[PDB]
Amino acid sequence: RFLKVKNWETDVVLTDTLHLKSTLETGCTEHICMGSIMLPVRTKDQLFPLAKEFLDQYYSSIKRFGSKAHMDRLEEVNKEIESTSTYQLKDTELIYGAKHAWRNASRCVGRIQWSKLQVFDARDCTTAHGMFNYICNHVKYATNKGNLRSAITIFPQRTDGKHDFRVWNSQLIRYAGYKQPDGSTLGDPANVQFTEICIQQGWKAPRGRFDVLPLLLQANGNDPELFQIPPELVLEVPIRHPKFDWFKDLGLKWYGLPAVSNMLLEIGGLEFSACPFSGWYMGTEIGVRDYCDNSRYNILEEVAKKMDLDMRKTSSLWKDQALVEINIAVLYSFQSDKVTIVDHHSATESFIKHMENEYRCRGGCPADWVWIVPPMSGSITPVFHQEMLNYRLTPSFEYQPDPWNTHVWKG
Amino acid sequence: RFLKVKNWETDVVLTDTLHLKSTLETGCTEHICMGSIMLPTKDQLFPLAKEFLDQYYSSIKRFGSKAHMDRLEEVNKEIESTSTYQLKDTELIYGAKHAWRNASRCVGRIQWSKLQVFDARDCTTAHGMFNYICNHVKYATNKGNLRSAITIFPQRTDGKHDFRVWNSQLIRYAGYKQPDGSTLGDPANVQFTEICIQQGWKAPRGRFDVLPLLLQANGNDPELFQIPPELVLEVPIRHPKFDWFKDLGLKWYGLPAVSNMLLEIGGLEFSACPFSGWYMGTEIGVRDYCDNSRYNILEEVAKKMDLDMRKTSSLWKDQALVEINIAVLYSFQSDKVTIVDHHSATESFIKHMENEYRCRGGCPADWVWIVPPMSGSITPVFHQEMLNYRLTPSFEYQPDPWNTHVW
Numbered sequence: 001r002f003l004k005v006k007n008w009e010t011d012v013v014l015t016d017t018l019h020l021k022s023t024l025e026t027g028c029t030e031h032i033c034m035g036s037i038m039l040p041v042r043t044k045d046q047l048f049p050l051a052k053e054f055l056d057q058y059y060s061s062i063k064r065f066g067s068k069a070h071m072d073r074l075e076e077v078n079k080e081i082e083s084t085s086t087y088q089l090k091d092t093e094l095i096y097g098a099k100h101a102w103r104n105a106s107r108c109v110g111r112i113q114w115s116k117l118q119v120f121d122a123r124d125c126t127t128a129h130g131m132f133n134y135i136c137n138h139v140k141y142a143t144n145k146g147n148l149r150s151a152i153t154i155f156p157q158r159t160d161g162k163h164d165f166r167v168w169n170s171q172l173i174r175y176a177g178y179k180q181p182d183g184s185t186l187g188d189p190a191n192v193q194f195t196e197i198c199i200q201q202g203w204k205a206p207r208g209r210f211d212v213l214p215l216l217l218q219a220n221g222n223d224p225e226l227f228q229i230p231p232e233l234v235l236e237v238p239i240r241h242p243k244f245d246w247f248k249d250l251g252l253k254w255y256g257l258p259a260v261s262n263m264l265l266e267i268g269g270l271e272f273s274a275c276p277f278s279g280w281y282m283g284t285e286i287g288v289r290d291y292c293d294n295s296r297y298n299i300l301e302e303v304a305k306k307m308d309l310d311m312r313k314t315s316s317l318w319k320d321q322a323l324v325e326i327n328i329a330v331l332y333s334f335q336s337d338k339v340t341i342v343d344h345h346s347a348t349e350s351f352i353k354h355m356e357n358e359y360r361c362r363g364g365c366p367a368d369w370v371w372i373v374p375p376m377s378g379s380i381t382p383v384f385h386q387e388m389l390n391y392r393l394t395p396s397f398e399y400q401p402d403p404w405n406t407h408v409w410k411g
Numbered sequence: 412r413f414l415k416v417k418n419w420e421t422d423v424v425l426t427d428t429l430h431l432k433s434t435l436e437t438g439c440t441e442h443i444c445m446g447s448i449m450l451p452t453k454d455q456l457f458p459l460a461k462e463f464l465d466q467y468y469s470s471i472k473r474f475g476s477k478a479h480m481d482r483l484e485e486v487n488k489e490i491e492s493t494s495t496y497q498l499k500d501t502e503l504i505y506g507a508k509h510a511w512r513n514a515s516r517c518v519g520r521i522q523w524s525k526l527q528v529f530d531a532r533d534c535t536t537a538h539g540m541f542n543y544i545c546n547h548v549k550y551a552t553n554k555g556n557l558r559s560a561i562t563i564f565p566q567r568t569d570g571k572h573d574f575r576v577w578n579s580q581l582i583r584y585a586g587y588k589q590p591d592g593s594t595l596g597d598p599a600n601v602q603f604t605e606i607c608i609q610q611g612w613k614a615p616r617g618r619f620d621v622l623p624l625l626l627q628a629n630g631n632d633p634e635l636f637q638i639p640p641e642l643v644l645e646v647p648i649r650h651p652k653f654d655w656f657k658d659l660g661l662k663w664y665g666l667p668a669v670s671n672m673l674l675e676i677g678g679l680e681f682s683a684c685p686f687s688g689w690y691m692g693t694e695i696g697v698r699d700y701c702d703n704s705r706y707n708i709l710e711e712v713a714k715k716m717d718l719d720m721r722k723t724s725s726l727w728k729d730q731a732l733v734e735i736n737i738a739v740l741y742s743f744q745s746d747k748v749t750i751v752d753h754h755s756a757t758e759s760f761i762k763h764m765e766n767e768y769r770c771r772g773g774c775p776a777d778w779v780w781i782v783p784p785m786s787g788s789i790t791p792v793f794h795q796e797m798l799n800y801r802l803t804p805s806f807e808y809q810p811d812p813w814n815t816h817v818w
């Protein structure tokens with residue numbers, strides 16, 4: 001079966017065959033499309049074909065398909081599964097696996113970089129203290145004094161689902177949010193609930209607008225423990241504007257390291273429930289979403305005031321005007337401080353080239369248009385005009401429930 | 412099977428039950444989502460009729476009435492005898508309004524019940540069509556105070572006698588290929604323009620030549636008509652702050668009028684059914700003016716603003732984009748021609764959604780089309796989960812007639 005995608009700007013037509021290797025569900029049916037929907041303990045039974053599927057892909061990739069090495073490995077994994085109900089990946093397989101989960105991540109526009117991923121094997125970790133040490137090392141390596149390097153740290157896989165390793169933070173670095181008794185919010189409104197948890201767990205909150213949250217780390221299904229990332233490891237960028245001298249006085253700054261820590265990495269049927277990964281920011285994540293969402297720092301008004309735009313009617317587009325300036329400032333600031341960042345034009349242009357390369361060499365590139373198109377200026381970027389097919393390949397990154405909702409407290 | 416949609420900005424959750432009346436297909440499967448893809452007898456006919464007549468009679472609190480049963484009976488008889496049937500005026504109007512109501516890619520559906528329906532089913536010739544279309548244009552335009560309208564020509568019979576408006580929209584600008592290798596006018600309309608010339612149009616070869624109508628009646632060959640220039644309201648584009656903006660020589664037409672779609676009501680197909688409302692500014696200022704494959708004016712404007720165009724990261728493109736969209740809105744407002752900005756329009760649609768969930772149990776919506784082409788996430792629709800499904804009556808895409816026409 002063949003599927004075609006068309007770019008409506010260039011009339012370039014691509015043919016997808018890769019989707020034939022798709023696995024899990026989309027959430028859609030012939031009767032309904034759930035394209036804009038944000039969200040959607042394993043037996044040996046289901047486990048061996050998943051292991052075998054993965055190992056076949058791995059051995060194909062190194063051009064050793066059907067080799068004695070391939071066959072021995074299947075044999076080895078098979079026995080280990082029937083003996084122990086699970087199996088351990090070789091280091092090479094883990095690395096291949098982690099890289100491919102990123103390659104497969106249909107919501108990630110940064111995938112041109114997928115083969116350059118530093119994989120830190122933390123499968124020997126046994127305690128929250130050990131997790132903390134690993135994560136510190138990841139932060140320091142990835143930050144690299146502003147010259148950011150993509151990395152992922154992989155903690156031990158799930159066993160019976162009662163000994164899960166989890167990073168409770170949604171991201172390694174985020175700012176605290178505090179609800180005031182008057183209903184106003186200080187800091188990042190999105191993080192109010194998680195901040196309360198941290199506080200309950202013993203965190204002494206400074207209660208400012210940009211307090212870096214402590215790590216809340218769970219090893220082996222035990223109660224999570226709090227750790228503060230050494231401040232000297234947390235790289236931050238004061239936000240200023242190249243033309244507007246008043247922008248610095250807004251008091252804005254942001255952290256340089258975007259690092260997702262709440263997702264589950266599936267490789268060959270195995271589940272890695274703690275697998276924090278990091279790259280570098282695309283400007284709009286901070287400038288559009290973090291700063292300008294009504295549910296976040298929500299600075300559009302203050303900025304527009306300082307620009308003295310006509311704010312009495314939306315049709316003056318004062319919001320769009322301020323939005324652009326804020327995004328210029330974020331890009332300006334990061335560049336001036338020599339902290340790796342990419343603008344939405346560069347990143348989408350590079351994604352289109354990555355995508356075409358993937359079609360040519362791989363027969364497809366699953367992509368979620370809803371997430372790929374940037375949250376400002378969508379149609380002046382090339383991805384807007386690009387038809388995409390969304391499907392799910394493994395290895396993959398999956399959502400998982402938030403740990404505070406499922407954890408059995410030991411006390 | 413009962414589905415929830417969440418707004419991630421407001422945490423409001425809505426429960427959709429209306430999707431369980433979905434009929435047509437999405438293109439999606441359990442293995443693959445095609446959400447970003449632009450394009451897709453007597454026995455077949457009566458259940459479709461019944462489905463529609465049932466929803467019609469339900470809408471007027473008369474479900475299971477004798478008038479309901481009698482109508483159903485009459486239609487069944489008429490299909491058995493004639494192989495088709497004719498809609499009552501009331502049914503035609505209900506159907507057209509609901510086709511709009513069901514248009515999942517339309518952000519402007521809060522206006523759906525306020526639609527003027529012109530019944531043009533008595534039309535027999537292309538001259539008749541031209542007259543009806545002029546009248547539509549004049550009514551809809553209303554000296555700048557736009558009113559939504561649809562004109563509905565005779566329904567398909569054996570498919571050999573289709574009425575078609577060959578133009579994709581009632582009002583558009585010609586496109587010509589230059590010996591300079593470049594393109595003059597609207598690049599998207601080169602092919603259609605050549606067909607007009609081929610069919611005898613004397614082209615002015617300007618940058619904003621309003622295309623003639625190419626009208627096909629009763630499956631006959633399409634004929635050419637020029638819309639009376641005085642009925643085509645256009646708006647010169649200026650900026651409230653940049654005096655030089657007027658010098659780009661830009662204008663656009665006030666009436667957005669889609670003319671290439673198929674209206675399906677109760678199994679009947681109306682292949683010629685031009686409809687119109689009023690513009691959302693981004694349509695002109697983002698897509699028409701700034702698409703690289705359209706008028707593509709970003710660089711020209713940017714230079715006039717003297718932005719640093721050396722590096723993408725100065726966001727000069729985004730800056731020019733905003734000003735271009737400011738000028739469009741300002742120009743229409745100044746000339747008192749109805750227009751709506753994307754903030755206002757998307758805010759309206761969120762209200763409409765909540766109404767539809769509250770009173771109908773859902774609202775089919777295509778997020779990919781509903782979210783505006785600029786400033787997506789500072790509009791409320793960005794943060795609104797939407798379920799996309801196909802309800803009938805419906806507007807459907809159909810094959811361009813030049814690939815179909817047996818000349």
Ligand code: HEM
Binds near residue numbers: 107260
């Ligand atoms: C190196 C430069 C990278 C760039 C510029 C980039 C860009 C982005 C952006 C803008 C998003 C959307 C984020 C949001 O809206 O919340 C995203 C999502 C995502 N990225 Fe990438 N990324 C990079 C690296 C990585 C790496 C190293 C991985 C994994 C190894 C990764 C995996 C993912 C996944 C799984 C998502 C979707 C997560 C979700 O649903 O919340 N990315 N990326």
Ligand code: HEM
Binds near residue numbers: 514522559687
């Ligand atoms: C009155 C104010 C209206 C507004 C502000 C509005 C807004 C829009 C916009 C922005 C689009 C996307 C068009 C594009 O990007 O090319 C659209 C599409 C659409 N609209 Fe509405 N519209 C209005 C009236 C109407 C009316 C009166 C009808 C039908 C009677 C209608 C039915 C549709 C349909 C079927 C589409 C999809 C067209 C396509 O697929 O190309 N709209 N509308």
Ligand SMILES: Cc1cc(N)nc(CCc2cncc(N3CCN(C)CC3)c2)c1
Binds near residue numbers: 173278280281
């Ligand atoms: C690997 C990676 C690269 C990149 N460019 N962005 C990301 C997302 C980073 C990120 C950091 N902090 C917070 C978030 N949140 C913002 C709020 N959003 C709702 C969820 C994601 C996301 C990850």
Ligand SMILES: Cc1cc(N)nc(CCc2cncc(N3CCN(C)CC3)c2)c1
Binds near residue numbers: 519580668686
């Ligand atoms: C009823 C209606 C209301 C509205 N605001 N917009 C529309 C779209 C109208 C429209 C006018 N001219 C041209 C187009 N084209 C632009 C190019 N695009 C690829 C197809 C649609 C669309 C229709």
Ligand SMILES: C[C@H](O)[C@H](O)[C@H]1CNc2nc(N)[nH]c(=O)c2N1
Binds near residue numbers: 370371372419794795
């Ligand atoms: C409801 C909708 O899916 C939601 O707002 C999505 C839209 N696209 C997105 N795209 C990115 N990159 N990140 C997001 O959080 C979202 N949110």
Ligand SMILES: C[C@H](O)[C@H](O)[C@H]1CNc2nc(N)[nH]c(=O)c2N1
Binds near residue numbers: 387
């Ligand atoms: C490939 C993609 O579907 C295409 O560029 C779409 C995206 N969203 C759109 N949305 C609207 N309203 N109109 C359009 O023409 C498009 N084009």
Ligand SMILES: [Zn+2]
Binds near residue numbers: 033443444
């Ligand atoms: Zn879908």
